Write an enzyme that holds these catalytic residues in place. Structure first.
Site, PDB file in Angstrom:
ATOM      1  N   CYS A  18       5.311 -49.932 -37.903  1.00 55.96           N
ATOM      2  CA  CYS A  18       5.996 -50.790 -38.856  1.00 55.96           C
ATOM      3  C   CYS A  18       7.214 -49.949 -39.293  1.00 55.96           C
ATOM      4  O   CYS A  18       7.543 -48.865 -38.695  1.00 55.96           O
ATOM      5  CB  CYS A  18       5.101 -51.100 -40.070  1.00 55.96           C
ATOM      6  SG  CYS A  18       4.523 -49.628 -40.973  1.00 55.96           S
ATOM      7  N   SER A  19       7.851 -50.265 -40.382  1.00 57.82           N
ATOM      8  CA  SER A  19       9.081 -49.561 -40.766  1.00 57.82           C
ATOM      9  C   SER A  19       8.855 -48.035 -40.802  1.00 57.82           C
ATOM     10  O   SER A  19       9.401 -47.237 -40.011  1.00 57.82           O
ATOM     11  CB  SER A  19       9.562 -50.096 -42.135  1.00 57.82           C
ATOM     12  OG  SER A  19       8.579 -49.927 -43.135  1.00 57.82           O
TER      13      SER A  19
ATOM     14  N   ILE B  71       3.382 -46.278 -42.095  1.00 55.30           N
ATOM     15  CA  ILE B  71       2.267 -45.926 -42.972  1.00 55.30           C
ATOM     16  C   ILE B  71       1.612 -47.085 -43.706  1.00 55.30           C
ATOM     17  O   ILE B  71       0.391 -47.093 -43.798  1.00 55.30           O
ATOM     18  CB  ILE B  71       2.610 -44.780 -43.956  1.00 55.30           C
ATOM     19  CG1 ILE B  71       3.758 -45.174 -44.871  1.00 55.30           C
ATOM     20  CG2 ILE B  71       2.914 -43.455 -43.208  1.00 55.30           C
ATOM     21  CD1 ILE B  71       3.971 -44.185 -45.996  1.00 55.30           C
ATOM     22  N   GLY B  72       2.370 -48.092 -44.158  1.00 59.15           N
ATOM     23  CA  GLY B  72       1.758 -49.186 -44.932  1.00 59.15           C
ATOM     24  C   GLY B  72       1.073 -50.241 -44.085  1.00 59.15           C
ATOM     25  O   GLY B  72      -0.149 -50.273 -43.986  1.00 59.15           O
ATOM     26  N   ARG B  73       1.862 -51.101 -43.443  1.00 65.83           N
ATOM     27  CA  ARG B  73       1.297 -52.073 -42.525  1.00 65.83           C
ATOM     28  C   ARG B  73       0.572 -51.402 -41.380  1.00 65.83           C
ATOM     29  O   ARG B  73      -0.486 -51.836 -40.968  1.00 65.83           O
ATOM     30  CB  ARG B  73       2.372 -52.995 -41.956  1.00 65.83           C
ATOM     31  CG  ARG B  73       2.935 -53.970 -42.932  1.00 65.83           C
ATOM     32  CD  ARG B  73       3.932 -54.891 -42.249  1.00 65.83           C
ATOM     33  NE  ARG B  73       4.853 -55.322 -43.254  1.00 65.83           N
ATOM     34  CZ  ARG B  73       5.913 -56.065 -42.992  1.00 65.83           C
ATOM     35  NH1 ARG B  73       6.135 -56.519 -41.752  1.00 65.83           N
ATOM     36  NH2 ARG B  73       6.692 -56.387 -44.009  1.00 65.83           N
TER      37      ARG B  73
END
Length: 259
Positions: free
Chosen positions: A193-194, A197-199
């Site tokens: 993802c960007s 770490i999050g998605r």
């Protein structure tokens, strides 16, 4: 079971990522791969003093993952070096190229029925299949000097928050699971993802927990915080928000309901 017993708020060196030569290879200055699990790139251009770095970590929970950021223009070639070297055959892309007017990932694949060379790597896009929640791209990867890499590009993640129900993510993950298992001795599944770490952490943690349920059944011991901490020892800060945390429990609960 998939019940939330603990609240979100209850939840190693990065020297290589910190080096001056690698500063422009990081999308965010302070989100860096741990040295002990980073993907080390070999066979680099001998004219480059530093050719071994990509902002990516191996995640080992058999299946393993590479958690990485969305490509920058100057890291597309290194991304394909990573996929080739690690024998990865499945890529999970969890963002649009651009979301709310901000670039999240450079396009690193050719259009359908086109081929492009990215440094020493040749990539041919032989077919796209466009499902409600994702597009599947059948890519063929070879050294310019071949293997099929299946890119699963999730389309429906909202630009704010998380999906309000996990059905799309579960369908997507199930296809990824069968594809990976269909390919003998495939390498780690690449997930991005960007920032990686999050998605990325949310997808990987869900997939790890679902795979436990596959092996041990619906009544097996699940410990989501323990699983998140285990992934966090391999890449900093995986699973970023409380909504992502709640989404993990919802996805696993829904998975259990399918059984």
């Amino acid at each position: 079971g998939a019940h939330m017993w603990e609240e979100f708020e209850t939840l190693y060196s990065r020297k290589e990522g910190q080096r001056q030569e690698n500063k422009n290879k990081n999308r965010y200055k302070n989100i860096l791969p741990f040295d002990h699990t980073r993907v080390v790139l070999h066979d680099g251009d001998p004219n480059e003093p530093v050719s071994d770095y990509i902002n990516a970590n191996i995640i080992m929970p058999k299946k393993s993952y590479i958690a990485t950021q969305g490509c920058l223009q100057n890291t597309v070639n290194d991304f394909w070096r990573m996929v080739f070297q690690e024998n990865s055959r499945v890529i999970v892309m969890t963002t649009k190229e651009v979301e709310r007017g901000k670039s999240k990932c450079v396009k690193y694949w050719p259009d359908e029925y086109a081929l492009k060379e990215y440094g020493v790597m040749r990539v041919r896009n032989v077919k796209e299949s466009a499902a409600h929640d994702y597009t599947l791209r059948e890519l063929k990867l070879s050294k310019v000097g071949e293997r099929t890499v299946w890119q699963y590009h999730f389309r429906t993640w909202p630009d704010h928050g998380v999906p309000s129900d996990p059905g799309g993510v579960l369908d997507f993950l199930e296809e990824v699971h069968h594809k990976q298992e269909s390919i003998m001795d495939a390498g780690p599944v690449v997930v991005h993802c960007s920032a990686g770490i999050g998605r990325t952490g949310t997808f990987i943690v869900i997939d790890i927990l679902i795979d436990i349920i596959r092996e041990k059944g619906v009544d097996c011991d699940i410990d989501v915080p323990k699983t998140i901490q285990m992934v966090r020892s391999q890449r900093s800060g995986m699973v970023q928000t409380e909504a992502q945390y709640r989404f993990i429990y919802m996805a696993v609960q829904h998975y259990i309901e399918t059984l």
